[PDB]
Design a binder for this molecule. Structure first.
Ligand SMILES: O=c1[nH]cnc2c(CCNCC3CCCCC3)c3[nH]c(NCCc4ccccc4)nc3cc12
Ligand SMILES: O=c1[nH]cnc2c(CCNCC3CCCCC3)c3[nH]c(NCCc4ccccc4)nc3cc12
Ligand SMILES: [Zn+2]
Ligand SMILES: [Zn+2]
Lengths: 356, 356
């Protein structure tokens, strides 16, 4: 397999469906990447069984303990965790800034160290070290922030390219900033493209602006990215967010909602989310969802999961989390197929009429 | 299959190996029964994969929530949890008493209600409602306690036998009390046998007396039970306890140690237990145990599990617990085979020289 190849097999409007080929495996796009030294409460085989092709490696926690160098000593994150498929590592910056300088962030994490850490973990897809601009932001602060990020983008690329083994086997994504301002988004897209990356993320959204605002910015911002490269909307999100995003040209997603929300009693369904802790589910013998193909909906009822979650049982987290990650993957498959058959617009309208 | 059949296929000294056949499945004896509306942090298929033939149903918690009647409404514990094999339910008394009267315990749980609850849960093996005598106990208090238990034993049998469906499909075990006193143990064994039960438990041990004392009492007490019926040592215990107990004629065991201890960082190994949280394991690429056949020892290292447990990760509990339950079952298989080939005494000496 090549180091990195993105091919689009079908389109409808702005939406695309296809594949990213990498040495460790093929990624079906639009893709949802579950967030992780584990994906909470799940074995990798379980994650794989749900249909995940790739997972997102939580660099900030790992960097802490057991540490990037230790994991490298132990053989890399893949071996450590037992996942042999692609891993996208974030740069550690979002969570750090959640003392700032041109060098990087003291809390010292810089683009160079960020790249080195992701290399030590053995990431397949490395993110450039950026700064997610707070919302709201004034045009000046938005610009100043973006401009620094573009500088950090160049250092990341140079850093990445300076390590032979990393450049030959991994891929590097660049991240667009510019808050909600078109001119700034364009300047950012221009800079990233001149540097050159394997993929392009849309940064700085899912920061408190709301869906209407997020979609308006995606409307002008995603066409600014190279068409022939994957488009990654960072930290999004709810089902309805992913559908609308795909409608605007996004190929990739990461979010903690399925996992976090799962342990909290929220289950995703085609008729919308439910909180299984509700008394209404105490004797409901139906599965979490009507149509879900997951193992959980195959073998346990609402009633059981309700009790487990009410009880604080670990098994509760496990089952809720497995269903939710399966549901997200099923969502992506439906997105992929509907695009493939040129029926995505209707799927997106049918999805929303039922989900809401 | 019959409602209940115990057959001994081999012996060595006091030790026996064989099978209990029941409608829901065969139990290989000596048996270890993992303790549970779940077996913490494990799916039933995982429990089964470790080699468990039967699990112990925690009546006291279930009785609380979601309640015995609700579970019956939902189809019984087997369906609820997703375990289709035999289930032994305790009577709820140990944990309750951990206001006393001849009727039962107010906290009101009586032999009659205890039996009814176990019936509502759909237990395959029902325990009589007893009172585990505190240790130490004077001969008078030991006697008074035992005598009440024998009375409660008779009510349990009558209760059980009064429900056609329960008597036709389940089995009933009686429990020996008498603290550490031989004469009292004999009187208890006599009473239980005159009433008649499908199996006989040795109650009132594993209460703070220590192994030397527990073994001395087992030495005279287990031969007091009917030879042709299974012998269940309640709430035991560590590996070394189970070996010595089997040496004295015990066929069945339950204990929380594998599960509890697992979530706490204690892993069982053939060279003795280890606490995986120890810094020494931070870069140890070996599996928890040298020879264990479990899936965990197949795929993850000490280092990884150490980090997970240090991190408070659910996956940590899951893996530690699966290994520990697998280790206990592997212990039982080795016990069963060694007995089968008449080499148990040497296995017990080889086990202890290595384990200690
Ligand atoms: O610009 C960004 N740069 C880098 N990371 C971002 C993240 C973290 C994505 N989730 C990873 C773990 C974001 N998460 C959200 N919302 C949730 N917005 C985000 C924006 C950025
Ligand atoms: O006599 C007894 N009668 C009934 N239950 C007993 C228990 C609970 C066994 N574990 C089930 C859950 C015991 N656990 C221990 N030690 C631990 N001693 C026990 C003695 C008795
Ligand atoms: Zn499901
Ligand atoms: Zn093991």
């Amino acid at each position: 397999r090549p180091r990195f190849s993105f091919s689009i097999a079908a389109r409808e409007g702005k939406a695309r469906t296809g594949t990213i080929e990498m040495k460790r495996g093929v990624i079906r796009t639009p893709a949802f990447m579950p967030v992780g030294a584990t994906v909470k409460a799940l074995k990798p085989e379980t994650v794989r069984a749900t249909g995940a092709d790739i997972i997102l490696g939580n660099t900030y926690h790992l960097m802490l303990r057991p540490g990037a160098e230790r994991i490298a000593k132990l053989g890399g994150l893949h071996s450590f965790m037992g996942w042999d498929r692609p891993i996208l590592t974030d740069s550690g910056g979002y969570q750090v800034m959640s003392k700032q300088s041109e060098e990087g962030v003291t809390f010292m994490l810089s683009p160079e160290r960020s790249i080195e850490i992701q290399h030590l973990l053995g990431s397949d897809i490395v993110m450039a070290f950026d700064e997610c601009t707070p919302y709201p932001a004034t045009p000046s602060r938005a610009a100043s922030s973006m401009e620094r990020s573009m500088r950090w983008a160049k250092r990341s690329r140079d850093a990445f390219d300076s390590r032979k083994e990393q450049a030959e086997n991994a891929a590097l994504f660049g991240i667009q900033q510019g808050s909600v301002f078109e001119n700034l988004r364009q300047q950012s897209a221009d800079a990233l493209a001149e540097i050159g990356f394997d993929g392009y993320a849309v940064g700085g959204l899912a920061v408190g602006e709301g869906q209407d605002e997020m979609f308006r910015v995606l409307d002008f911002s995603v066409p600014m990215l190279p068409d022939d490269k994957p488009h990654y909307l960072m930290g999004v999100g709810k089902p309805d967010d992913i559908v609308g995003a795909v409608e605007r040209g996004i190929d990739m997603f990461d979010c903690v909602l399925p996992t976090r929300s799962g342990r909290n009693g929220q289950a995703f369904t085609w008729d919308g989310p439910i909180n299984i802790r509700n008394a209404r589910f105490s004797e409901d013998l139906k599965p979490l969802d009507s149509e879900c193909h997951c193992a959980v909906c195959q073998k346990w009822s609402r009633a059981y999961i309700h009790h487990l979650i009410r009880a604080g049982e670990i098994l509760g987290a496990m089952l809720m989390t497995e269903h939710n990650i399966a549901f997200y993957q099923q969502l992506m498959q439906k997105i992929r197929d509907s695009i493939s058959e040129g029926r995505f617009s209707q799927f997106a309208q049918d999805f929303r009429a039922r989900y809401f």
